[PDB]
Design an enzyme around this catalytic site. Structure first.
Site, PDB file in Angstrom:
ATOM      1  N   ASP A  45       0.837  -1.218   0.000  1.00  0.00           N
ATOM      2  CA  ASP A  45       0.000   0.000   0.000  1.00  0.00           C
ATOM      3  C   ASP A  45       0.870   1.267   0.000  1.00  0.00           C
ATOM      4  O   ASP A  45       1.597   1.527   0.971  1.00  0.00           O
ATOM      5  CB  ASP A  45      -0.937  -0.009   1.229  1.00  0.00           C
ATOM      6  CG  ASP A  45      -1.932   1.152   1.216  1.00  0.00           C
ATOM      7  OD1 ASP A  45      -2.956   1.048   0.496  1.00  0.00           O
ATOM      8  OD2 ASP A  45      -1.671   2.179   1.911  1.00  0.00           O
ATOM      9  N   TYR A  50       3.169   9.750   0.235  1.00  0.00           N
ATOM     10  CA  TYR A  50       4.136   9.132   1.121  1.00  0.00           C
ATOM     11  C   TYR A  50       5.542   9.450   0.650  1.00  0.00           C
ATOM     12  O   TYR A  50       6.516   9.183   1.362  1.00  0.00           O
ATOM     13  CB  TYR A  50       3.902   7.611   1.083  1.00  0.00           C
ATOM     14  CG  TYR A  50       2.537   7.205   1.600  1.00  0.00           C
ATOM     15  CD1 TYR A  50       1.629   8.149   2.177  1.00  0.00           C
ATOM     16  CD2 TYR A  50       2.143   5.882   1.520  1.00  0.00           C
ATOM     17  CE1 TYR A  50       0.337   7.706   2.638  1.00  0.00           C
ATOM     18  CE2 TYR A  50       0.864   5.449   1.953  1.00  0.00           C
ATOM     19  CZ  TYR A  50      -0.013   6.381   2.498  1.00  0.00           C
ATOM     20  OH  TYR A  50      -1.235   5.905   2.915  1.00  0.00           O
ATOM     21  N   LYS A  79      -2.609   6.160  -4.443  1.00  0.00           N
ATOM     22  CA  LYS A  79      -3.734   6.988  -4.001  1.00  0.00           C
ATOM     23  C   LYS A  79      -3.552   8.390  -4.575  1.00  0.00           C
ATOM     24  O   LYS A  79      -2.443   8.973  -4.580  1.00  0.00           O
ATOM     25  CB  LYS A  79      -3.818   7.123  -2.457  1.00  0.00           C
ATOM     26  CG  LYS A  79      -3.757   5.783  -1.761  1.00  0.00           C
ATOM     27  CD  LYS A  79      -4.159   5.887  -0.255  1.00  0.00           C
ATOM     28  CE  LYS A  79      -3.846   4.512   0.482  1.00  0.00           C
ATOM     29  NZ  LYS A  79      -2.381   4.367   0.862  1.00  0.00           N
ATOM     30  N   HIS A 112      -7.676   9.311  -2.001  1.00  0.00           N
ATOM     31  CA  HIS A 112      -7.036   9.101  -0.683  1.00  0.00           C
ATOM     32  C   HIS A 112      -7.975   9.593   0.420  1.00  0.00           C
ATOM     33  O   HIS A 112      -8.005   9.034   1.555  1.00  0.00           O
ATOM     34  CB  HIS A 112      -5.671   9.861  -0.622  1.00  0.00           C
ATOM     35  CG  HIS A 112      -4.710   9.339   0.411  1.00  0.00           C
ATOM     36  ND1 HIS A 112      -3.347   9.356   0.214  1.00  0.00           N
ATOM     37  CD2 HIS A 112      -4.899   8.928   1.694  1.00  0.00           C
ATOM     38  CE1 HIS A 112      -2.733   8.909   1.292  1.00  0.00           C
ATOM     39  NE2 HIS A 112      -3.643   8.683   2.226  1.00  0.00           N
TER      40      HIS A 112
HETATM   41  N1  LIG Z   1      -5.809   5.798   3.508  1.00  0.00           N
HETATM   42  C1  LIG Z   1      -5.257   6.617   4.474  1.00  0.00           C
HETATM   43  O1  LIG Z   1      -5.618   7.782   4.666  1.00  0.00           O
HETATM   44  C2  LIG Z   1      -4.273   5.957   5.414  1.00  0.00           C
HETATM   45  C3  LIG Z   1      -4.036   6.504   6.703  1.00  0.00           C
HETATM   46  C4  LIG Z   1      -3.144   5.869   7.567  1.00  0.00           C
HETATM   47  C5  LIG Z   1      -2.470   4.736   7.189  1.00  0.00           C
HETATM   48  N2  LIG Z   1      -2.708   4.211   5.845  1.00  0.00           N
HETATM   49  C6  LIG Z   1      -1.991   3.023   5.279  1.00  0.00           C
HETATM   50  O2  LIG Z   1      -2.041   1.981   6.279  1.00  0.00           O
HETATM   51  C7  LIG Z   1      -0.736   1.657   6.646  1.00  0.00           C
HETATM   52  C8  LIG Z   1      -0.761   1.164   8.113  1.00  0.00           C
HETATM   53  O3  LIG Z   1      -1.393   2.047   9.092  1.00  0.00           O
HETATM   54  P1  LIG Z   1      -0.403   2.903  10.040  1.00  0.00           P
HETATM   55  O4  LIG Z   1       0.679   3.604   9.340  1.00  0.00           O
HETATM   56  O5  LIG Z   1      -1.283   3.764  10.818  1.00  0.00           O
HETATM   57  O6  LIG Z   1       0.354   1.946  11.019  1.00  0.00           O
HETATM   58  P2  LIG Z   1      -0.137   0.486  11.714  1.00  0.00           P
HETATM   59  O7  LIG Z   1      -0.278  -0.638  10.727  1.00  0.00           O
HETATM   60  O8  LIG Z   1      -1.331   0.711  12.629  1.00  0.00           O
HETATM   61  O9  LIG Z   1       1.154   0.142  12.608  1.00  0.00           O
HETATM   62  C9  LIG Z   1       1.351   0.916  13.816  1.00  0.00           C
HETATM   63  C10 LIG Z   1       2.787   0.537  14.390  1.00  0.00           C
HETATM   64  O10 LIG Z   1       2.687  -0.872  14.639  1.00  0.00           O
HETATM   65  C11 LIG Z   1       4.048  -1.333  14.659  1.00  0.00           C
HETATM   66  N3  LIG Z   1       4.015  -2.834  14.482  1.00  0.00           N
HETATM   67  C12 LIG Z   1       3.912  -3.436  13.305  1.00  0.00           C
HETATM   68  N4  LIG Z   1       3.898  -4.764  13.493  1.00  0.00           N
HETATM   69  C13 LIG Z   1       4.026  -4.962  14.838  1.00  0.00           C
HETATM   70  C14 LIG Z   1       4.160  -6.099  15.631  1.00  0.00           C
HETATM   71  N5  LIG Z   1       4.027  -7.364  15.085  1.00  0.00           N
HETATM   72  N6  LIG Z   1       4.320  -5.889  16.983  1.00  0.00           N
HETATM   73  C15 LIG Z   1       4.406  -4.689  17.568  1.00  0.00           C
HETATM   74  N7  LIG Z   1       4.337  -3.544  16.826  1.00  0.00           N
HETATM   75  C16 LIG Z   1       4.155  -3.712  15.454  1.00  0.00           C
HETATM   76  C17 LIG Z   1       4.808  -0.554  13.601  1.00  0.00           C
HETATM   77  O11 LIG Z   1       6.031  -0.054  14.217  1.00  0.00           O
HETATM   78  P3  LIG Z   1       7.458  -0.586  13.572  1.00  0.00           P
HETATM   79  O12 LIG Z   1       7.598   0.011  12.191  1.00  0.00           O
HETATM   80  O13 LIG Z   1       8.554  -0.123  14.556  1.00  0.00           O
HETATM   81  O14 LIG Z   1       7.469  -2.146  13.538  1.00  0.00           O
HETATM   82  C18 LIG Z   1       3.849   0.626  13.302  1.00  0.00           C
HETATM   83  O15 LIG Z   1       4.550   1.872  13.252  1.00  0.00           O
HETATM   84  C19 LIG Z   1       0.083   2.954   6.349  1.00  0.00           C
HETATM   85  O16 LIG Z   1       1.498   2.662   6.361  1.00  0.00           O
HETATM   86  C20 LIG Z   1      -0.485   3.335   4.997  1.00  0.00           C
HETATM   87  O17 LIG Z   1       0.038   2.387   4.030  1.00  0.00           O
HETATM   88  C21 LIG Z   1      -3.598   4.816   4.963  1.00  0.00           C
HETATM   89  C1  LIG Z   2      -4.938   9.969   9.310  1.00  0.00           C
HETATM   90  C2  LIG Z   2      -3.944   9.990   8.126  1.00  0.00           C
HETATM   91  C3  LIG Z   2      -2.774   9.292   8.072  1.00  0.00           C
HETATM   92  C4  LIG Z   2      -2.171   9.518   6.852  1.00  0.00           C
HETATM   93  C5  LIG Z   2      -0.859   9.037   6.241  1.00  0.00           C
HETATM   94  C6  LIG Z   2      -1.173   7.708   5.507  1.00  0.00           C
HETATM   95  O1  LIG Z   2      -1.989   7.696   4.491  1.00  0.00           O
HETATM   96  O2  LIG Z   2      -0.456   6.760   5.904  1.00  0.00           O
HETATM   97  N1  LIG Z   2      -3.127  10.313   6.055  1.00  0.00           N
HETATM   98  C7  LIG Z   2      -2.939  10.929   4.694  1.00  0.00           C
HETATM   99  C8  LIG Z   2      -4.199  10.654   6.923  1.00  0.00           C
HETATM  100  C9  LIG Z   2      -5.325  11.589   6.435  1.00  0.00           C
HETATM  101  O3  LIG Z   2      -5.072  12.439   5.574  1.00  0.00           O
HETATM  102  C10 LIG Z   2      -6.630  11.635   7.130  1.00  0.00           C
HETATM  103  C11 LIG Z   2      -6.945  12.878   7.698  1.00  0.00           C
HETATM  104  C12 LIG Z   2      -8.217  12.869   8.347  1.00  0.00           C
HETATM  105  C13 LIG Z   2      -9.056  11.779   8.376  1.00  0.00           C
HETATM  106 CL1  LIG Z   2     -10.561  11.922   9.178  1.00  0.00          CL
HETATM  107  C14 LIG Z   2      -8.718  10.531   7.815  1.00  0.00           C
HETATM  108  C15 LIG Z   2      -7.467  10.497   7.157  1.00  0.00           C
END
Ligand SMILES: NC(=O)c1ccc[n+]([C@@H]2O[C@H](COP(=O)([O-])OP(=O)(O)OC[C@H]3O[C@@H](n4cnc5c(N)ncnc54)[C@H](OP(=O)(O)O)[C@@H]3O)[C@@H](O)[C@H]2O)c1
Ligand SMILES: Cc1cc(CC(=O)O)n(C)c1C(=O)c1ccc(Cl)cc1
Length: 303
Positions: A45, A50, A79, A112
């Site tokens: 993803d 990013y 995205k 996104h």
């Molecule tokens: N669509 C959007 O707006 C949006 C928003 C937020 C995120 N995302 C996508 O979703 C992905 C994941 O969500 P996120 O970035 O919020 O992080 P997440 O998957 O919730 O991970 C949170 C933390 O968990 C840790 N972790 C991972 N595996 C673990 C394990 N087995 N045990 C203990 N800790 C562990 C990682 O730290 P370490 O790196 O130190 O292992 C990470 O920084 C993003 O990278 C992005 O690709 C999209």
């Molecule tokens: C939370 C968050 C984390 C990231 C980085 C990622 O994609 O990893 N993004 C771009 C956001 C948003 O823009 C975001 C802002 C407000 C709301 Cl309600 C939902 C998403």
């Protein structure tokens, strides 16, 4: 394994999260993306935002070149960022992502977020943005198209658009045991739209938009109890929970041992009682909580 999307393409149910804050060198993305693919991840993803699509695409190309995987084995998501919602900007943004990654197509391209920004908020009819996304699917730039951070009203807006050609295949949203989105999940299932969970491990707790007072999901005592009962880890419980509710789950990690651990989610299962216990943690807690977007006209948590 994979879920069949509503356009007939297949999406691996566990995805690798590539976002890391700006303090982490851009070159780390290259290294950890190759480790992810080595550990068994096949869904990767990323996003224009990013600033890592060069490194992520090079990791995927490196694993193709050394014979570990074929292109058609990898599901790569990018995205469209929210300054590019105006319909004439959608296909150029996608082409730019393809050039950065050096790939011929993405497996998935998402809006996104619904919160349009000046190309400072902007007002854009997201139905017209969606028509431009449809055109990118028809051109073969994206095999599938989807949305992210949409609420049910926002999703209905698209599903209800006159002359709709493709439904979104998915809605990628914040989803974990503190904010489990059951009702939105039910709505998505009723329309054959996949819910894809991000911050499934509790987010990176980025100081720019997450309150440090918020509970640390992986220190949750019910997840710790389940991890001890199954001799696994709190992270694996949180991931496994999503799989068992029909949610595709992302997991970001830039640590070699945790990346390899996370693929163990396919190795065990939770019981109905375990799942009810995790369902009991739901508490309307979204880790994103900042003045930066909370008063945006299309903020999705306004409901
Ligand atoms: N669509 C959007 O707006 C949006 C928003 C937020 C995120 N995302 C996508 O979703 C992905 C994941 O969500 P996120 O970035 O919020 O992080 P997440 O998957 O919730 O991970 C949170 C933390 O968990 C840790 N972790 C991972 N595996 C673990 C394990 N087995 N045990 C203990 N800790 C562990 C990682 O730290 P370490 O790196 O130190 O292992 C990470 O920084 C993003 O990278 C992005 O690709 C999209
Ligand atoms: C939370 C968050 C984390 C990231 C980085 C990622 O994609 O990893 N993004 C771009 C956001 C948003 O823009 C975001 C802002 C407000 C709301 Cl309600 C939902 C998403």
């Amino acid at each position: 394994q994979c879920v069949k999307l509503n356009d007939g393409h297949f999406m691996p149910v566990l995805g690798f999260g590539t976002y890391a804050p700006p303090e982490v060198p851009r070159s780390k993305a290259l290294e950890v993306t190759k480790l992810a693919i080595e550990a068994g991840f096949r869904h990767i993803d990323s996003a224009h935002l990013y600033n890592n699509e060069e490194q992520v695409g090079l990791a995927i190309r490196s694993k193709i070149a050394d014979g570990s995987v074929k292109r058609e084995d990898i599901f790569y998501t990018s995205k469209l960022w929210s300054t590019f919602h105006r319909p004439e900007l959608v296909r150029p943004a996608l082409e730019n992502s393809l050039k950065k990654a050096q790939l011929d197509y993405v497996d998935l391209y998402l809006i996104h977020s619904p919160m349009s920004l000046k190309p400072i908020f902007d007002i854009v009819d997201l139905c017209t943005t969606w028509e431009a996304m449809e055109k990118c699917k028809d051109a073969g730039l994206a095999k599938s198209i989807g949305v992210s951070n949409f609420n049910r009203r926002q999703l209905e807006m698209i599903l209800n658009k006159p002359g709709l050609k493709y439904k979104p295949v998915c809605n990628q949203v914040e989803c974990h045991p503190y904010f489990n989105r059951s009702k939105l999940l039910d709505f998505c299932k009723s329309k054959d739209i996949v819910l894809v969970a991000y911050s499934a491990l509790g987010s990176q707790r980025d100081k720019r938009w997450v309150d440090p007072n918020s509970p640390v999901l992986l220190e949750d005592p019910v997840l710790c109890a389940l991890a001890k009962k199954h001799k696994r880890t709190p992270a694996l419980i949180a991931l496994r929970y999503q799989l068992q509710r029909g949610v595709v789950v992302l997991a970001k990690s830039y640590n070699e041992q945790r990346i390899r651990q996370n693929v163990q989610v396919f190795e065990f299962q939770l019981t109905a009682e375990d799942m009810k216990a995790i369902d009991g943690l739901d508490r309307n807690l979204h880790y994103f909580n900042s003045d930066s977007f909370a008063s945006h006209p299309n903020y999705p948590y306004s409901d």
